[PDB]
Design a protein around this nucleic acid. Structure first.
Ligand SMILES: [Mg+2]
Ligand SMILES: [Mg+2]
Ligand SMILES: [Mg+2]
Ligand SMILES: [Mg+2]
Ligand SMILES: [Mg+2]
Ligand SMILES: [Mg+2]
Ligand SMILES: [Zn+2]
Ligand SMILES: [Zn+2]
Ligand SMILES: [Zn+2]
Lengths: 37, 178, 129, 220, 144, 56, 63
RNA sequence: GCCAGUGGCGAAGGCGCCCGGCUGGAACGGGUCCGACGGUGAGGGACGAAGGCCAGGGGAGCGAACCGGAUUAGAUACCCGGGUAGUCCUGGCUGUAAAGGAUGCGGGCUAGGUGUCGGGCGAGCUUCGAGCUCGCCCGGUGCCGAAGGGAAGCCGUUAAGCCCG
RNA sequence: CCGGAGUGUAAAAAGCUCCGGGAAUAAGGGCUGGGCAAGGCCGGUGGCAGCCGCCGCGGUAAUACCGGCGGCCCGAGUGGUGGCCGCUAUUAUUGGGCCUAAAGCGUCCGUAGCCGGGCCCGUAAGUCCCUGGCGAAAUCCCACGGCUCAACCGUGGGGCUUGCU
């Protein structure tokens, strides 16, 4: 990924590692329901 | 992509500056002007003179010398400068000088009107001649040579010295700053 | 790497003048650095310059007199006709005949004033005020 | 001025001289390293500075200090004074009330008085008379980067209101400006203009440029 | 360092980089790709005509408390539903359903929403060929 | 008019509120050494124009 | 003016004579090679990281 | 491991038991040679921590997942006991990091002070030691710092200053 | 303004000259808390209704809504919506920034490209000067003339066309 230190800050945010992990799970589901099912 | 006739007056960059407003209010009462438009028209006349003078300071010969001469002889002809004048004097000039070269103002002077507002009415109702010609435009800038030929019209009751308003106006023979 | 000894020389003069040094040394000398200093002397911005000779490109010793505010190279050596010096003045100088733009011409390295009175343009290479 | 001079006892070496009739001109005051701690000195040698006109208040800010028991407010006042020839000063003053702050700001302004160069250096006037500055000049304070350029006669002051005020008090009638930074910071804008007007002195010249640019260091 | 290409024979790459970063300019991008024209229901117009579908009310953001009146309006040139705010005091009562209404922009910063009305981009101006300002100030009663 | 003083080191026309200084030449008298703030704070040596006494 | 203007060598060429043959021979003070007498093959200066260590110069000169 | 450091080497990642062999690069010294051969680099290539994957080995300690004991209102955790992958080796792929000096590279100029590493020079001392101390030059690496710069913090000849790209 | 006569016009109308009558026949739009010139006024509503380009006002004393009185700006126009330029050095050649605010590729290598040390000689491609031919008219600037001045039109001077030769 391209990332943003701004996003790494926490003032009004959730942690970026975990945002990232969520994004990747979504992407996996989408990829999964796209190509074969 | 054609010509598109453009205004010959410039409006101010901000409409609500207290300094400019006060100054213009005073000028408009002194010279009896209907419109800021009219005032700004004369201001723009001045500005264009000034810009030409600037360019010709920062210009070079064989042309921009012609235009120097033309500017100076135009301003002489209008009565804004003397014949021995220069571009420095152009930059010294003022909108008040222009407005003083209006017809309304010269008729408030030349003891013809008793008031700039009555001068306006005389001009507009057709009682002023300039070189034999009726002029009805009070914003007409008089030339320094036409100034001494200003007079009531021959077909004007004010040209009859028995006229009441003529009698009042000459009861108060006054001039000077206008 | 090294590029434009002239710009380096002028920047050195500028910085040394800021700190009040009386003499500077310009190490990769050139005929152009020398002409520019000839002009700067003639228009009274520096004092006295002398070419020291090593085995290398030679050095210039330059005695200053406290009459420089900003001296610099116009490095895109700009072609300038004989009737554009007004604009380049307005870009590089603070008042109408204040400093000096140095112009390389076919008739030598000159000031824009001399270029104007000769009716010849050229390429701008430096300014000094 | 005799009026303040009577009431005034000097407290300083400079004030002693001024009272004593020595140092009769503000030009003799300045370029000597001297220490001005007395608006009375400045008023004596430059009495037009005592005038409500020729004084200008340029900004009033209510600044806050927090405490237990809440907010304690102070008033910062940016004022300028000047003789409309070539002398101007700029001061900040603080108070619990605006009037205290104002009189303090004006005192500090008279202490921060400076002397400027005036002239004509524009390509399109060359009138050799001191309506503008004689050469472009730059000044800064904070993020503000003020670059003043000479203008032609009758142009006016092409600058924000703060610069208009300061330059009017300094006797500059015509000027062009280019600015960078936050000019909505009045303090730093004003100080930038002020510092530019001092850099008029910092700039060097050649012999004939005085005559050709009409350079004038104080009164004309 | 000193910026990109400053050389005398570098105008090509200089022009190129300025173009590259104009595309980071968002105004230029919208103008040149015509995104507003693609997403605008008014189809690049200052006004529009519509049929009032319903009259509704909208709650002001957070600090303000009020129910701003509005109407859902079906625009004719495309058949698209947009919501428009009815300025004035009894404007929503002067307006009725199935009425033809003229639709201006509400003002607002980026041709967008204005004030405490979160998500309304349009104003009502005329109602059955009569100005709502005059209807509200009493004059010029409505035809239908 | 009046004249503006000039540093004996930098020759750079002392300004109004500069932390400058002036004093007669020691070992010569008869000469006012002017010294600008930059020169003082940077330890720029001067030199009397009449004599050649250098000094800091 | 000093120490960088016209950067000048610190090294010197110096005349030495061997102890065995006694032939005067010019050499360099900072050699990269072991210098040998042209007649005897005797080491006159042994090389180091800098100034070479000098053997056989009891009558010496430097230019 | 202790020694081991604002220490050193390296493009960075990173590199610490000793001995031998092969090998890279730098600094210093250099009246050696070549003779502008240089800088930057779109695109392109190589290297690239941990982790992960393919295959094959190995498997002490630690140990995601998991399994149990506690804690707690709850406790999918922190604590405890175990424990699979993995951590190690071989050969490949992956090509990501707070991969950070959060500071692209080159060149010139603008006070210095004080350390420290390396080389050199000159002196002094010496237990005559690849030794110690002082100073100077070059190059590294740090602290401080006037001017200067900056929104400030802070930077400040190892610039975040001026100039040339 | 009303009426009438002449001229005007292809005819007519307008305009122009004249006669007669009569101050009659003729001022709005926006704003009014700050930006931003202008109200410590009054009545109504009372977190409702409403305003609000932005800031923000309004929950029982509202200069911020509605209205009356007043005042300010422009004025035969004044406001609203959309668009372009400017504001904006928020696209930066002039003229921006990249430690901490958006932003230095993880590091290196190198192709094109761009930037390139000093002297001498030559060429004269760029470059500069001078001159020939062209770059329509209108449009732009200036003066001077004609319609009452002006706008408009003409005479002349200059410029414009990216320039090309
Ligand atoms: Mg520090
Ligand atoms: Mg308001
Ligand atoms: Mg932007
Ligand atoms: Mg920026
Ligand atoms: Mg950042
Ligand atoms: Mg044409
Ligand atoms: Zn000095
Ligand atoms: Zn002396
Ligand atoms: Zn021998």
């Amino acid at each position: 990924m391209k990332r943003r230190p701004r996003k790494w800050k926490k003032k009004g945010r959730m942690r970026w590692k975990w945002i990232k992990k969520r994004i990747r799970r979504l992407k996996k589901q989408r990829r999964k329901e796209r190509g074969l099912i | 992509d054609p010509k598109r006739q453009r205004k010959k007056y410039e409006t101010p960059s901000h409409p609500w500056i207290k300094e400019r407003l006060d100054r213009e209010r005073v000028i408009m009462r002194k010279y009896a002007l209907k419109n800021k438009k009219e005032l700004w028209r004369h201001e723009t006349q001045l500005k264009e003179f000034r810009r030409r003078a600037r360019r010709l300071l920062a210009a070079r010969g064989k042309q921009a010398e012609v235009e120097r001469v033309q500017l100076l002889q135009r301003l002489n002809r209008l009565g804004l400068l003397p014949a021995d004048a220069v571009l420095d004097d152009v930059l010294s000039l003022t909108v008040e000088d222009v407005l003083d070269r209006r017809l309304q103002t010269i008729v408030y002077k030349k003891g013809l009107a008793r008031t700039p507002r009555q001068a306006r009415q005389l001009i507009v109702h057709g009682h002023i001649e300039v070189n034999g010609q009726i002029i009805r435009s009070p914003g007409y800038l008089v030339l320094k040579a036409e100034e001494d030929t200003i007079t009531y019209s021959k077909t004007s009751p004010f040209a009859r010295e028995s006229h009441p308003e003529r009698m009042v106006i000459e009861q108060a023979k006054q001039g000077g700053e206008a | 790497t090294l590029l434009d000894p002239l710009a380096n020389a002028l920047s050195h003069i500028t910085n040394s003048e800021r700190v009040g040094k009386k003499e500077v040394y310009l190490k990769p000398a050139s005929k152009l650095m020398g002409e520019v200093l000839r002009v700067m002397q003639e228009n009274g911005y520096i004092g006295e310059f002398e070419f020291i000779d090593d085995g290398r490109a030679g050095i210039y010793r330059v005695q200053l007199i406290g009459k420089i505010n900003k001296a610099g190279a116009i490095k895109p050596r700009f072609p300038v006709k004989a009737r554009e010096y007004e604009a380049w003045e307005k870009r590089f100088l603070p008042a109408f005949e204040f400093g000096i733009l140095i112009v390389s011409t076919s008739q030598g390295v000159m000031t824009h004033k001399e270029a104007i009175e000769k009716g010849i343009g050229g390429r701008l290479i430096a300014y000094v005020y | 001025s005799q009026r303040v001079l009577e009431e005034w006892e000097p407290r300083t070496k400079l004030g002693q001289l001024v009272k004593a009739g020595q140092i009769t001109d503000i030009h003799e005051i300045f370029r000597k390293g001297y220490q001005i701690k007395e608006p009375e000195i400045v008023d004596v040698l430059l009495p037009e500075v005592n005038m409500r006109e020729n004084q200008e208040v340029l900004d009033i800010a209510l600044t806050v200090r927090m405490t237990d028991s809440g907010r304690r407010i102070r008033f910062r006042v940016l004022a300028a004074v000047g003789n409309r020839d070539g002398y101007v000063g700029l001061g900040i003053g603080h108070g619990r009330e605006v009037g205290i702050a104002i009189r303090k700001a004006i005192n500090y302004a008279k202490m921060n008085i400076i002397e400027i160069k005036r002239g004509c250096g524009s390509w399109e006037c060359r009138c050799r008379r001191p309506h503008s500055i004689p050469f472009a000049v730059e000044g800064k304070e904070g993020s503000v980067r003020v670059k003043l350029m000479p203008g032609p006669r009758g142009l006016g002051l092409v600058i924000g209101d703060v610069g208009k005020k300061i330059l009017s008090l300094a006797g500059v009638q015509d000027v062009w400006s280019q600015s960078l930074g936050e000019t909505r910071t009045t303090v730093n804008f004003a100080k930038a203009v002020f510092n530019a007007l001092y850099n008029t002195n910092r700039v060097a010249i050649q012999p004939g440029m005085e005559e050709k640019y009409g350079i004038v260091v104080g009164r004309e | 360092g000193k910026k990109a290409p400053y050389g005398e024979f570098a105008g090509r790459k200089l022009k190129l980089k300025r173009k590259k970063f104009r595309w980071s300019d968002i105004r230029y991008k919208r103008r040149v790709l015509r995104l507003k024209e693609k997403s605008d229901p008014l189809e690049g117009a200052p006004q529009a005509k519509g049929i009032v579908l319903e009259k509704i009310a909208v709650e002001a953001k957070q600090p303000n408390s009020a129910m701003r009146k509005a109407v859902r309006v079906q625009l004719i040139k495309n058949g698209k539903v947009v919501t428009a705010f009815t300025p004035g005091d009894g404007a929503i009562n002067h307006i009725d359903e199935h009425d033809e209404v003229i639709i201006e922009g509400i003002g607002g910063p980026k041709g967008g929403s204005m004030g405490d009305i979160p998500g309304i981009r349009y104003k009502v101006v005329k109602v059955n060929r009569v100005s709502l300002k005059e209807l509200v100030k009493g004059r010029k009663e409505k035809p239908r | 008019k009046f004249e503006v003083p000039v540093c004996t080191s930098c020759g750079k026309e002392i300004t109004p509120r500069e932390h400058a200084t002036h004093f007669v030449c020691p070992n010569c008298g008869e000469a006012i050494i002017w010294r600008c703030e930059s020169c003082r704070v940077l330890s720029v040596p001067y030199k009397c124009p009449k004599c050649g006494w250098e000094g800091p | 003016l000093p120490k960088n203007l016209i950067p000048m060598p610190k090294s010197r060429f110096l005349r030495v004579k061997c102890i065995d043959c006694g032939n005067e021979q010019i050499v360099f003070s900072n050699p990269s090679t072991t210098v040998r007498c042209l007649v005897c093959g005797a080491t006159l200066v042994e090389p180091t990281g800098g100034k070479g260590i000098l053997k056989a110069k009891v009558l010496e000169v430097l230019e």
